[PDB]
A paper describes a structure:
To reveal the underlying basis for dNTP binding and incorporation by the AEP domain, we performed crystallization studies. One apo-form structure was solved and refined up to 2.6-Å resolution, showing that the AEP domain is composed of two subdomains: ModN (aa 1–90) and ModC (aa 91–285). In the AEP domain structure, the Met1-Tyr20 region is disordered. However, the region Asp10-Tyr20 is well ordered in the full-length C962R structure, folding into one α-helix (α1) and forming extensive hydrophobic interactions with the D5_N domains. The Ala273-Ala285 region forms one helix in the AEP domain structure, but is disordered in the full-length C962R structure. The Leu21-Val37 region folds into one helix (α2) in the apo-form AEP structure, but it is disordered in the binary and ternary structures of the AEP domain. The apo-AEP structure was solved by molecular replacement (MR) method using the model predicted by AlphaFold2 and the Phaser program of the CCP4 suite.
Residue numbers in the entry: 21 to 42, 47 to 280
Write the structure that this text describes.
């Protein structure tokens, strides 16, 4: 733990400079809030990944803010008491359905862009409920656009059919309706009494405004070869694999 303590004091000395005053990151272990600029987020995520690779206990939260990446928090009750299979072919269709509502939102920028979907599930169940996040960290959109996509996915009959076929006993009440507001847990961190979400697989989706009908979805190879906490952050913009796709958003109106 010696090398973990060295990083913990390093984080404390590098983030104390950004202590909130009369907010994007919360350290629930220490109860201190910080206002980090985007230029300094990559160094922060670089230090967390070091602590993650050593199994350090951390509990950092990331406020989704008004304009950031999209997260979908599912809390599913399964037909059996075992964790969901979540085969790659099933999650690929989920990506397609999620993207159909993204394209229909009319916020995507012009040109060719790479979208990355990430699926992390909770290791153990809480109150008989299993959960998994669908992180689209590089695709930055407004909070209202997230509520539109979330509301559409709640009524998406195709998504409900897939979940029910996988054994989900609550396909209509599993998607958190407040997914656009809850802070995103950084990858390696979790509550003291709960295990951290583990990344199963990610998918790469290439989209071109020229040909909108061609939507190839391929699985990501060597995801663990990247700074996972940085690639999965909804507010990171300096990732290597995940490159930001800035969607249309009225910044000020979205805050008001």
């Amino acid at each position: 733990l010696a090398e973990v303590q060295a990083l913990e004091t390093l984080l404390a000395r590098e983030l104390s400079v950004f202590l909130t005053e009369p907010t994007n990151i919360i350290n629930r272990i220490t109860g201190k809030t910080y206002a980090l600029p985007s230029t300094e987020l990559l160094r922060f995520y670089e230090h967390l990944e070091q602590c993650r690779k050593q199994g350090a206990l951390m509990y950092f939260l990331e406020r989704q803010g008004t304009y950031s990446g999209l997260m979908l928090d599912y809390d599913l009750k399964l037909n059996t008491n075992a964790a969901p299979s979540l085969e790659s072919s099933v999650l690929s269709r989920l990506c397609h359905r999620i993207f159909v509502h993204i394209k229909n939102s009319s916020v995507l920028p012009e040109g060719s862009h790479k979208i990355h979907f990430f699926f992390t599930l909770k290791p153990e169940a809480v109150q008989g409920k299993y959960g998994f996040h669908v992180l689209i960290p590089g695709l930055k959109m407004a909070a209202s656009t997230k509520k539109s996509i979330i509301a559409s996915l709640q009524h998406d009959a195709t998504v409900q059919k897939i979940l029910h076929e996988q054994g989900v006993a609550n396909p209509e009440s599993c998607l958190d309706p407040h997914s656009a507001s809850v802070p995103s847990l950084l990858y390696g961190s979790s509550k003291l009494n709960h295990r951290p979400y583990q990344l199963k697989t990610g998918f790469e989706l290439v989209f071109d405004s020229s040909d909108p009908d061609y939507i190839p979805i391929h699985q990501i190879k060597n995801i663990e070869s990247y700074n996972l906490v940085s690639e999965l952050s909804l507010t990171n913009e300096q990732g290597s694999l995940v490159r930001p796709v800035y969607c249309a958003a009225d910044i000020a109106a979205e805050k008001e």
